[PDB]
Ligand binder design. Structure first.
Ligand SMILES: Nc1ncnc2c1ncn2[C@@H]1O[C@H](COP(=O)(O)OP(=O)(O)O)[C@@H](O)[C@H]1O
Lengths: 55, 269
């Protein structure tokens, strides 16, 4: 294949960097869930059931 | 408020306290409210400072001056009725007090209803369920729940319609309703500010909630209601009503329901 220098020339919309209510609430929910997951008292079997989902 | 007066230099704290009383007389009828009373007038035997002992003396004399300052009532708030210098509670001065405590389940629902007067609620919103779940919450926390649930509904819908400005069309505002998911979200974010303190309330337990013990339920009514429902018979026969009863036996048999059930029927705390 031959790359074309023109593929790297693109200008973003001005509103690109303005995050929505769903994007901001999603991140804050994940922050609360991440702290909760670190606090959870669970056995190795429950830990593996989640980790194994990516294999 | 205590801490603001105490933040002043010696002489400034006393002058500022006196001014408030002089202004109240000029503007009578007037009410002077002193917040954090234990901070402005802590127990003298519990401190070392001369200024703190002096400001207590200044408040004590200003309270006594209320016999001359017509139509002026002084109110104060503290966290604990026994955390203030006892002199303030002597005859005259602060001769009345009222225990506000913590709202009960009914009051918590009332607070949620008050802080939703203007809010459009969806059919799935159930504030009674919230009031029962919000154990340990006070009005400051329930107000936060209402405002936070409103914001979540506003950000989901209105923030995708309106500009970042101070003026919104009335129709857009009226089209925004708050769902139960927004109240549940706020509930998970809020944390009760008064969870450890004991809450006193009229219980909702009734006699129909207790299985068995039919004779005990009646006996409590005789012990608690009869002395005031039929006082002429107790006087006629020279009977001295009992002041209380002790229960004993295995745990988990309904002892808590027995005391609550009679309190419920009697509408007592
Ligand atoms: N006689 C009963 N009838 C109905 N429910 C009961 C009875 N006894 C106990 N319970 C249930 O058991 C729970 C615990 O009762 P309680 O009197 O608080 O036990 P404890 O001895 O631990 O105080 C109550 O919430 C009540 O619902």
């Amino acid at each position: 294949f031959q790359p074309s220098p023109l593929a790297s020339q693109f200008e973003l919309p001005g509103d690109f960097f303005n995050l929505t209510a769903e994007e901001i609430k999603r991140e804050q929910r994940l922050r609360s869930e991440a702290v909760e997951r670190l606090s959870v008292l669970r056995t190795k079997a429950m830990r593996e059931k989640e980790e194994q989902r990516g294999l | 408020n205590g801490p603001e007066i105490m933040s002043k230099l010696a002489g400034e704290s006393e002058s500022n306290l006196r001014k408030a009383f002089e202004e109240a007389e000029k503007n009578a009828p007037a009410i002077i409210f002193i917040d954090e009373l234990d901070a402005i007038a802590p127990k003298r035997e519990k401190t070392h400072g001369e200024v703190e002992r002096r400001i207590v003396s200044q408040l004590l004399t200003l309270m006594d001056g209320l016999k001359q300052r017509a139509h002026v009532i002084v109110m104060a708030a503290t966290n604990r009725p026994n955390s203030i210098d006892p002199a303030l509670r002597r005859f005259g001065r602060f001769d009345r007090e009222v225990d506000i405590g913590i709202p009960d389940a009914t009051g918590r629902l009332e607070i949620l209803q008050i802080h939703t007067k203007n809010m459009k609620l969806a059919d799935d919103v159930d504030l009674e369920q919230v009031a029962n779940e919000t154990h340990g919450h006070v009005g400051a926390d329930l107000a936060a729940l209402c405002s936070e649930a409103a914001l979540q509904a506003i950000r989901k819908k209105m923030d995708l319609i309106d500009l970042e400005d101070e003026t919104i069309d009335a129709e857009v505002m009226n089209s925004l309703a708050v769902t139960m998911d927004d109240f549940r979200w706020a509930l998970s974010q809020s944390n009760p500010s008064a969870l450890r303190e004991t809450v006193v309330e009229v219980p909702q337990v009734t006699w129909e909630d207790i299985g068995g013990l039919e004779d005990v339920k009646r006996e409590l009514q005789e012990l608690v209601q009869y002395p005031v429902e039929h006082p002429d018979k107790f006087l006629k026969f020279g009977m001295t009503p009992s002041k209380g009863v002790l229960f004993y036996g295995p745990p988990g048999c309904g002892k808590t329901l027995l005391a609550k059930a009679i309190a419920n029927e009697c509408q007592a705390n």
